Amino acid sequence: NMSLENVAFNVVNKGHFDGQQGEVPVSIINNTVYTKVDGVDVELFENKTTLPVNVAFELWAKRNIKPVPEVKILNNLGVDIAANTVIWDYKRDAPAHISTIGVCSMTDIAKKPTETICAPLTVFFDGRVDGQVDLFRNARNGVLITEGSVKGLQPSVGPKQASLNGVTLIGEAVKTQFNYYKKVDGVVQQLPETYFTQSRNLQEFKPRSQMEIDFLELAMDEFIERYKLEGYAFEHIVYGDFSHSQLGGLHLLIGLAKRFKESPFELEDFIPMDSTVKNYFITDAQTGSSKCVCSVIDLLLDDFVEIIKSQDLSVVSKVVKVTIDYTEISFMLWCKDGHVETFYPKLQ
Amino acid sequence: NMSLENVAFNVVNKGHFDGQQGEVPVSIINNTVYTKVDGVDVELFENKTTLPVNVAFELWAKRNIKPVPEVKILNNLGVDIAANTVIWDYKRDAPAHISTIGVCSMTDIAKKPTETICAPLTVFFDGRVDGQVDLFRNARNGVLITEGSVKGLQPSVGPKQASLNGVTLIGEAVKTQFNYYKKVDGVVQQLPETYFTQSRNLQEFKPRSQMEIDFLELAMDEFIERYKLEGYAFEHIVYGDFSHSQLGGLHLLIGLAKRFKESPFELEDFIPMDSTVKNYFITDAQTGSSKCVCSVIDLLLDDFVEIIKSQDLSVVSKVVKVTIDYTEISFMLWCKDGHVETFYPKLQ
Amino acid sequence: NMSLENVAFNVVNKGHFDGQQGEVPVSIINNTVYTKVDGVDVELFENKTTLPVNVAFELWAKRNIKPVPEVKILNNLGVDIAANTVIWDYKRDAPAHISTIGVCSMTDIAKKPTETICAPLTVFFDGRVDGQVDLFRNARNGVLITEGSVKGLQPSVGPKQASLNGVTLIGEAVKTQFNYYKKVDGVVQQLPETYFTQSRNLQEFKPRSQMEIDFLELAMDEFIERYKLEGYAFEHIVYGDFSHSQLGGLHLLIGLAKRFKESPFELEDFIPMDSTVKNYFITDAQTGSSKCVCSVIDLLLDDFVEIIKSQDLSVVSKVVKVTIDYTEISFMLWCKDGHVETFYPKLQ
Amino acid sequence: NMSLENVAFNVVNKGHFDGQQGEVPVSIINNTVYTKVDGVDVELFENKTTLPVNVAFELWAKRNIKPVPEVKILNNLGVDIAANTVIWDYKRDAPAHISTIGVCSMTDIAKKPTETICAPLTVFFDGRVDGQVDLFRNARNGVLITEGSVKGLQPSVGPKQASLNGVTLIGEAVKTQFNYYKKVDGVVQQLPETYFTQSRNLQEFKPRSQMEIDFLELAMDEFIERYKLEGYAFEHIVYGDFSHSQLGGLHLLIGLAKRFKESPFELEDFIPMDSTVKNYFITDAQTGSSKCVCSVIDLLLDDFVEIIKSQDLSVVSKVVKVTIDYTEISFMLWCKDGHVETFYPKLQ
Amino acid sequence: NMSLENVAFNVVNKGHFDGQQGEVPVSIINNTVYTKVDGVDVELFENKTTLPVNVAFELWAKRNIKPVPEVKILNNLGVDIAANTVIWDYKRDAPAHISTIGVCSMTDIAKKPTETICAPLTVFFDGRVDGQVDLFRNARNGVLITEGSVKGLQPSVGPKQASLNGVTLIGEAVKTQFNYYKKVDGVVQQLPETYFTQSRNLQEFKPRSQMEIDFLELAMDEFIERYKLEGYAFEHIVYGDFSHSQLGGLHLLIGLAKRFKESPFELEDFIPMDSTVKNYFITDAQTGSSKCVCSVIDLLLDDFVEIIKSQDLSVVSKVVKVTIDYTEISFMLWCKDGHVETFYPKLQ
Ligand SMILES: [Cl-]
Ligand SMILES: [Cl-]
Ligand SMILES: [Cl-]
Ligand SMILES: [Mg+2]
Ligand SMILES: [Mg+2]
Structure with missing residues (x-):
């Protein structure tokens, strides 16, 4: 009962595979599946996988909806x-x-x-x-x-x-x-106990706490004073340093969202996959500051504050493990004179 | 006089085929046509058709402008x-x-x-x-x-x-x-007598009647009262029902346009072609309501009102044929107790 | 229930499409059709056509046997x-x-x-x-x-x-x-009344008349005197001239078969298709004589003798149309002093 | 340090992967691996597999020699x-x-x-x-x-x-x-106790027993009387019947080798793979007799005689399972009036 | 007016590019050039190069004839x-x-x-x-x-x-x-003064000297005594050793031609290109002896005898540079007790 023409029938009539009987004519060329609609070919699926075109077409049609x-x-x-x-x-x-x-x-x-x-x-x-x-x-x-x-x-x-x-x-x-x-x-x-990433994006970023609402509305100096964040290097870690050729910090997605509303920048997603920590090649268009590997994570701002306030700051540098999305994420914590120098997620 | 290099000459000099004499060097690779410009190859045409690359390139160059x-x-x-x-x-x-x-x-x-x-x-x-x-x-x-x-x-x-x-x-x-x-x-x-679709799009939707202007400006209850639309299920058909897992109604493009300005959503154009009735796999981002096959048509709101007010509502369900764009479009009309339950275009 | 998987089922079980029911798993990649036979993919069809791979596969499976x-x-x-x-x-x-x-x-x-x-x-x-x-x-x-x-x-x-x-x-x-x-x-x-080509190949050539048996066995001077072919340029038309850099004559396949058993040569079929007259780029390996366009036709030698012996030898150059394989084949007849110079089919 | 360039270095210097260190420049295009040898690209490997080109290239280089x-x-x-x-x-x-x-x-x-x-x-x-x-x-x-x-x-x-x-x-x-x-x-x-196929080819077939030497040298009626094969349908099973449009019998490779030296024929291996029993689409060139699915097996003729002579000839039709190459091969035994009609392996 | 269609016109009418004017319709697909001959596409050129298909097609059409x-x-x-x-x-x-x-x-x-x-x-x-x-x-x-x-x-x-x-x-x-x-x-x-390779092939090998005629006709012990070749390891260098799992010697093409007429073997040309010295992966079918890198050169046997007989046999191992085809070819000369062990060209 399985067939390529039957899978294409379900897609054109049900939007996906629904287990219905029927067949439509199909032509396969250029890693693409086509169907003839009133004498002309209409693209149904462009294979972007490493699997054969007809195999990937069937799996995508049978995807979980x-x-x-x-x-x-x-x-x-x-x-x-x-x-x-x-x-x-x-x-x-x-x-x-x-x-x-x-x-x-x-x-x-x-x-x-x-x-x-x-x-x-x-x-x-x-x-x-x-x-x-x-x-x-x-x-x-x-x-x-x-x-x-x-x-x-x-x-x-x-x-x-x-x-x-x-x-x-x-x-x-x-x-x-x-x-x-x-x-x-x-x-x-x-x-284990775990935090969860928020899975938001830059264009459509929406705050999910009053702290995040205040972060986007208030200025940097006013926000750090209100939430008593002196000595935690939020100017570097969250807001980002753009004064030098190498971009400094900027590891929380909400910090990128606040910057993106003011000035645009380029994000090169050189490992395009779903992961708890994303690594981007970032180039700031306003200043020219850039960084090849900018580790970014989308944590709730309150959760990130709880993490950084829960660490010992008496050591120059060490590795901090945080369970996020049911996996151990290794952070690098740098401190000087009892205050945070920087704090960022590592590669993997 | 016909030649691939002559067609490419016209494209680079006239923006399309203009019947001019001349030849430029051309290389064809990866279903793409390239030309050498000062020693480097520049893409002129990526073949997205089921025809040979050089054939489709010639037809596109000779398209009606x-x-x-x-x-x-x-x-x-x-x-x-x-x-x-x-x-x-x-x-x-x-x-x-x-x-x-x-x-x-x-x-x-x-x-x-x-x-x-x-x-x-x-x-x-x-x-x-x-x-x-x-x-x-x-x-x-x-x-x-x-x-x-x-x-x-x-x-x-x-x-x-x-x-x-x-x-x-x-x-x-x-x-x-x-x-x-x-x-x-x-x-x-x-x-025959026929209605015509408006061929508008979501991002750039513009109203073409005072009723459409009032539809976008006013609220649902206020609009239905002003135009005396009680009993025609415009809340379901036009505004759409998002309270349940299965998206209800939402069959007019102007209803999608009004919703799109408030909240975003995903439209999967699984039959990418020009047709009077479009079928989309829609997923609402705000609520999570979705529907595999959402038949959408872009009629003038006044025209859709004239159609739905011109039907007999004494039968549970029947098929309504409407001539639109010089073709017969089959609608499914559902009524209960003399009022409209739903009213939507069918597949084909 | 016409389907790609069903076509492949018939091919593997019946050697071709036999209208039987059943499906086998199929993988399409690189203009080739594969099927899984106990874990591994086995090639069933390499598309050598200008049609989509699955379409040409179906047509080949439904070919007339x-x-x-x-x-x-x-x-x-x-x-x-x-x-x-x-x-x-x-x-x-x-x-x-x-x-x-x-x-x-x-x-x-x-x-x-x-x-x-x-x-x-x-x-x-x-x-x-x-x-x-x-x-x-x-x-x-x-x-x-x-x-x-x-x-x-x-x-x-x-x-x-x-x-x-x-x-x-x-x-x-x-x-x-x-x-x-x-x-x-x-x-x-x-x-129309027509001759027919014999459709033999150079490797497996087999004579079909006593005259053809003689031509392969006998020497040139013995054969020409035997069948009274003086003044008909068979030394040039059929046997071929290799004394010069440009190959002369050699327009009958039986003449090629005689030369091939002695010393091999190269045939470049730059128009690979079935046609009554075939054009070849020929390079003789022993002498180095060659010719870009060599018109060859596989007639019965008795037929060609009947053709050449019914021509008027009193004209310097005349076009001669002969119906072969139900089509009119044009020949160039060159004569000089009561005998023919050459008589070959046009490339047309 | 496993790498594509290192695999290519071993292939060009050692004929295969030999674990040596070194790299050579490699170009990948059109499912083929190339390397530069003094300016020009030389093809090293044409991927005939369903794997990525560089992967199959590495596996082929590491094949067992x-x-x-x-x-x-x-x-x-x-x-x-x-x-x-x-x-x-x-x-x-x-x-x-x-x-x-x-x-x-x-x-x-x-x-x-x-x-x-x-x-x-x-x-x-x-x-x-x-x-x-x-x-x-x-x-x-x-x-x-x-x-x-x-x-x-x-x-x-x-x-x-x-x-x-x-x-x-x-x-x-x-x-x-x-x-x-x-x-x-x-x-x-x-x-299990098993027979083994001889794995010979049709072109270079060479006998391996005095019986096989006799079969190729002797005539059908002389061979059958010599080895007392009356009533075992060797004229059909081994020698094959070409008198009808549908080819009959011809299930032993030695029978094909005998026919091939006399007159050629066409073998279409529509399942190109290694298997104990091979199915071919056969077309005899001399008579025009053919058959879509011809089951062939290359057993020692003495073994097949031992097999056929141990069967009960008192049943009209019986399935016979024989262990060959460590697998059970099913045969169809048709008998009539104390002698066999046919005895061939199933396509399975 | 250089064009793809004009190049194809010359190929179909003149067998190659002859500078004639005219155009024929061309279809490019799958790295192959096609042309329409009375409705159907006929393949004219399959691009085996690393260049774009239309470019390599033009170069091949303009090749030196x-x-x-x-x-x-x-x-x-x-x-x-x-x-x-x-x-x-x-x-x-x-x-x-x-x-x-x-x-x-x-x-x-x-x-x-x-x-x-x-x-x-x-x-x-x-x-x-x-x-x-x-x-x-x-x-x-x-x-x-x-x-x-x-x-x-x-x-x-x-x-x-x-x-x-x-x-x-x-x-x-x-x-x-x-x-x-x-x-x-x-x-x-x-x-420089140089030898030249004979550029013969294994299938159609033909001797070019009385010594080469003797080598093919005579037995090994008869030939070596005839041309006084005792102590020069011709049994190894030219005739080859098949007694062991690893194939020994066999570095002259005439030695391969002698073995091939007796029993066939497999030649894997893992660097398919024209070169003075060729390296092959050889597998002898009769004995099972093989060698991954077998250096072969097609010199006139009289030349190789002249080369080997001018060496100093008093050194255990010496590199010997010989100018062949205007390039210096390095040989490994191994000698033991006044006679040579082996003398083969390096793979270089
Ligand atoms: Cl009649
Ligand atoms: Cl034991
Ligand atoms: Cl001079
Ligand atoms: Mg910026
Ligand atoms: Mg929404």
């Missing part, structure tokens, strides 16, 4: 494969995982998660689908998300936001905050 | 080929028709429209070109456009707007509203 | 399209015709030859298939082949040989000699 | 991956296996076969390499080849021939006959 | 570019040089060799063309070939054979032996 965790979250938890679904990575325009389970015959390593080949793999389970909670209880390694309680399992509350068709949002007509569960070698794991 | 009907109009009239010109489909970045007549030797099926091979085809004629009106009188099947009257033929007034170099506009320094004529098997046809 | 006329015959008769089949051009590794009739959705212009679109086209009908003779009677332009007589239709006996899966042969377990019929504008044409 | 089992043997044993080597499939011009173990970073699933990821996979071990026998003892699923005895392991004597750089041969200066061992789920399997 | 020196000769002389012509490397299916002079606008660095840009480059001049000898006198760096004497210039007699359209031959109807001249920095260089 419900609110799902962001890929960085699934990566930080070590997820290798999804159970009977396709998590589409819109950052890479490619499937988030190599193989599939009961989805596409060309990429399927198994039909159901209980098969032997799935034993060493951390399978992602969705409690919103019938039987996936019970499948998670019988899985050796797996990650489970639910909207409510699971009897006999202690939950971990995830981020407020989730990805819906490549749109990260805090749901109002839909539920985006899940309970997280993980098993390793048959043993349920206790997930 | 005058105001022409939008492709959806030509499609709805069943046009198969153009007479001694190339209608470029900027929505697909491809020629609107497969074959040509007296344009490109590789795609030409004939040199002049009077040839035998053109008999079963609906040829598009442009009265603004000398002799094309008379050629239309001797053609078996054809469509003719003019700026003025044609002796012995009853005209049909077309849309106010036309496409100029992929820019749809109502001409002020140029004439964009044409008279339409059609012949089938040698018999002149009488074109 | 019965003895069919050689493409040069169909070309000389002006065939543009076949009725409900695909004639595969094995010399081009591509379909012999652009469009199809009731074969492939992507290339079909019609499902039946009786449709209006097929009238101006010369449709090829196979009288061995039920109902094709009647369709030929109803077609405006067409070509018909049959094994026996059709009531009322004056036949034209075709060549002894036909192409079976790319192998040209005179059938013994199957019949390769057909009657030929042609209609132009609804009127049956009388096919 | 010692006598290795033929891929059909490894396939019939269920091998999925090799331990610290690459088995190159020369019939597919591609690696015989998808992933690698400690070979290439792009395709490695592990650096050592003992890693957890390799347990459910059947790993191929080469006992000629130090430490591979011990790794086989510790592997859960695996296949081992050795030249001599392993203490405690009951051997299975493999075929006389092996593949050396794409050349299948019975070694004289090297040993090509191995012992075979197999483990499934940590338990050593006893390999 | 006269007897030209073999590329290895031009390489050994350091030629970088040709004057107003294209030397086509048929072993690479690519131009022998990167840039051109007055040939193709895309690859031209100059229209005349006298231009300033050509001075540091070694330009190849063909004295058979009017005015090229004078251009050689005015060029700073260059190489000149002539058929006869040039006044004042001391000639160097080149090899007997030359390449005519990819066919290397000793001309009879044409002259393939030239005088050679070379200038470096405006000063004429005296070319």
Whole structure:
């Protein structure tokens, strides 16, 4: 029943694969899928993946169209494969995982998660689908998300936001905050205390706390005085130093957002992927200050204040580990004379 | 006299093919045409069509650079080929028709429209070109456009707007509203009464009536009261329902325009082509409400009111046919207790 | 349920498309069709055509696997399209015709030859298939082949040989000699009296007459005196002149076969296609004699003798039109003092 | 320091990857690897695989250059991956296996076969390499080849021939006959008693028994009476029937070799891969007899005689399973009135 | 009026570029040039070069069709570019040089060799063309070939054979032996006394001396005693050793031709290019002996005997430089107890 022409039928009639019968004529050329509409070819899908065009086309058509965790979250938890679904990575325009389970015959390593080949793999389970909670209880390694309680399992509350068709949002007509569960070698794991990134962007940045509202409204000197931030180098870390050829600091996305409203700048996303810490080649258009590797993270400003105020500042330099998005992020803390010189996330 | 290097000469010197003599050096690689400018290669054309690169390059260079009907109009009239010109489909970045007549030797099926091979085809004629009106009188099947009257033929007034170099506009320094004529098997046809879509877009939406001006300025409850629209489900059909996971209604482009100014959303144009009814996979960023197939049409708000007020509302559901852009559009009308439940265009 | 995966299923299980149901996983990459056979991809089809890979793959799978006329015959008769089949051009590794009739959705212009679109086209009908003779009677332009007589239709006996899966042969377990019929504008044409090329190859050349047996066995001076060929320039036309830098004569394939068994040479087929007359760039390896455009034709030697011996030798230069493979082949006849200088086919 | 330029250095200096240090300039274009040799690019590798060009280039350079089992043997044993080597499939011009173990970073699933990821996979071990026998003892699923005895392991004597750089041969200066061992789920399997195909080709076929010498020299009626083969349908099974349009029988490669020396024919290998039974689309050039799916197997003629002469001829139709190349091959045995009608291998 | 369509016109009508006027329709797709011949596309050129498809097509059409020196000769002389012509490397299916002079606008660095840009480059001049000898006198760096004497210039007699359209031959109807001249920095260089390789192939090998006739006819022990070759390791150097797993010796092409007529073997040319010494990955099919890097050279056997018999046999290991094809070839001479062990050319 599986066929390329049937997949294209579902896309043109249902917007995605819906399991409907029918076939439309398809021509494949230039890593692109076309269909003939009233005698002319219309592009349906441009393959941006490393997979064959018809294979990637099928996986994208069968992508999950419900609110799902962001890929960085699934990566930080070590997820290798999804159970009977396709998590589409819109950052890479490619499937988030190599193989599939009961989805596409060309990429399927198994039909159901209980098969032997799935034993060493951390399978992602969705409690919103019938039987996936019970499948998670019988899985050796797996990650489970639910909207409510699971009897006999202690939950971990995830981020407020989730990805819906490549749109990260805090749901109002839909539920985006899940309970997280993980098993390793048959043993349920206790997930650690973690912060969560806010997954915002520059153009559409919106404050989510009165501190962030005051950060964008007030000036630098007035904001640092109001929240008693003297001696923490927020002028460097958050606001950024543009007086020299090498750009200084500017490691919080909200600091880039405040600057972007005043003056534009160039951000080179040379590792285009979903990750907790993003690295950009930045060039400021107003001053000419630039930096090849500017590590940026989108933390709630209140959370970043709690972190930097929770450190010992009696050492010149050391490595600070912070659990964010269920992964350990290494920060580099520099201090002189008991005050913060700088504080930034490292590469990986 | 035809040559690839001569076509590239005209593009670099005249912006398009102008019939001038000359040749520039050309290199073709990666479905792209390049020319050497002072020792370096400069991209001239990236082939986005299903045709060979050099063939598509020639057709695009010879595209019509005058105001022409939008492709959806030509499609709805069943046009198969153009007479001694190339209608470029900027929505697909491809020629609107497969074959040509007296344009490109590789795609030409004939040199002049009077040839035998053109008999079963609906040829598009442009009265603004000398002799094309008379050629239309001797053609078996054809469509003719003019700026003025044609002796012995009853005209049909077309849309106010036309496409100029992929820019749809109502001409002020140029004439964009044409008279339409059609012949089938040698018999002149009488074109039916039809509405016309406005061919506007979200970012640059501009109201074209006081009702549309009031729709964007006033609130929903205030607008429905002013124009006495109680019982027609404009809250659902036009304004859209975002309270549930499945997006409800929102089938008029002006309703999307009003929403877009307040909150952003994602529109997946999974059938990228010019058509009277567009189908989008929509995801609302503020609420999370989404719908795989949201049929949207850009009618003048006054015209849509006239249509929905001209229907019988005593049946649960039925199919309503409306002639728009010279084609029959099937709508689905749902009523309960004598009032409109919903009313939306179908797929095709 | 026509599909790419179903076409591949028939190919792997039946060697071609046999109308069986079933699907196998398919990967498309680099203009090649692959399928998974126990883990690894196996190449099924390398697209050598100008069509999309999946389209040409379907047409090749649906190619006619019965003895069919050689493409040069169909070309000389002006065939543009076949009725409900695909004639595969094995010399081009591509379909012999652009469009199809009731074969492939992507290339079909019609499902039946009786449709209006097929009238101006010369449709090829196979009288061995039920109902094709009647369709030929109803077609405006067409070509018909049959094994026996059709009531009322004056036949034209075709060549002894036909192409079976790319192998040209005179059938013994199957019949390769057909009657030929042609209609132009609804009127049956009388096919002209014609010679036929023998369609032999240089490697596996085999004589077909006692004269051809003698030509290969006998020396030049012995053969010319035996069959009384003095004054007919066979030393030049058939045997060829290698004494000069520019190769002279050598226009009959049997003359090439005789030279090849002695000393090899290089044949550059710069127009790789099936045609009654072939043009080659020839380079003799032993002497170094060459010629850019060498016109070669594979006639029965007895036929060529019959042709050359019926010419008027009293003119310095005369064009001579001979009907070969149902097409008129022009020859250049040069004579001097009551004997011919040369007599070769034009490249045309 | 693994790199593309270093791999190319080894290829140009050592003919393959030899672990030497050095780099040469490399150009990648059109799925081909080039290198500059005194100004001009020389092609080193044309990627015929479904892998990226640089990846397949590295795997081909690291291919095993010692006598290795033929891929059909490894396939019939269920091998999925090799331990610290690459088995190159020369019939597919591609690696015989998808992933690698400690070979290439792009395709490695592990650096050592003992890693957890390799347990459910059947790993191929080469006992000629130090430490591979011990790794086989510790592997859960695996296949081992050795030249001599392993203490405690009951051997299975493999075929006389092996593949050396794409050349299948019975070694004289090297040993090509191995012992075979197999483990499934940590338990050593006893390999079944099996016949082996001879792996000869049609062009360079050479007999290997006095019976095979007789078959090629003797006539059909003389050979059948000599080896007392009356009532075993050798005229059909081995010699083949060409009297009808559909080719009959001809299922032993030695029968094809006998026919080929007399008159040539066309073999279309629509599944180009190494397998115990091969399916061909055959077209006989002399008679025109053909058959879409012709199952062929290259057994020693004495073996096939031993097989056919041990069957019960008292049943109309019976399936017969024979273990050949360590896999069960199904045959169709048709008998009528105390003698066989046909006896051919299924395409399976 | 240089154009792609005009180049294709010359190719189809003249077999190459002949400067004739005319255009034919051309389709470019998949690094191949096509043209329409009565409806269907016929392949004219498959780009095997690293240049753009239309550029390499033009250079191939403008290739030199006269007897030209073999590329290895031009390489050994350091030629970088040709004057107003294209030397086509048929072993690479690519131009022998990167840039051109007055040939193709895309690859031209100059229209005349006298231009300033050509001075540091070694330009190849063909004295058979009017005015090229004078251009050689005015060029700073260059190489000149002539058929006869040039006044004042001391000639160097080149090899007997030359390449005519990819066919290397000793001309009879044409002259393939030239005088050679070379200038470096405006000063004429005296070319060294040199041997020449015979440029034969393994399939069509033909001896060129009574000694070579004897070597092929006579047995090893009979030949070595006949030409008094005791103590010169011809059993190893020329005949080759197959008794061991690693192939020994076999460095003269005539030795390969003798072995090939007896039993076939596999030659892998991992550096496919024209060079005085060729390196092959050899696998003997009969014995299984192989060697990754086998240096082979096609000298006249009498020349190699003259070379080996002039060496001092009193040293264990000595490097020996011999000028062959105008370049110095290094040999490894191993001797032991008054006789040679081996004597082979280095891979260099
Ligand atoms: Cl009759
Ligand atoms: Cl033992
Ligand atoms: Cl002189
Ligand atoms: Mg700025
Ligand atoms: Mg919104």
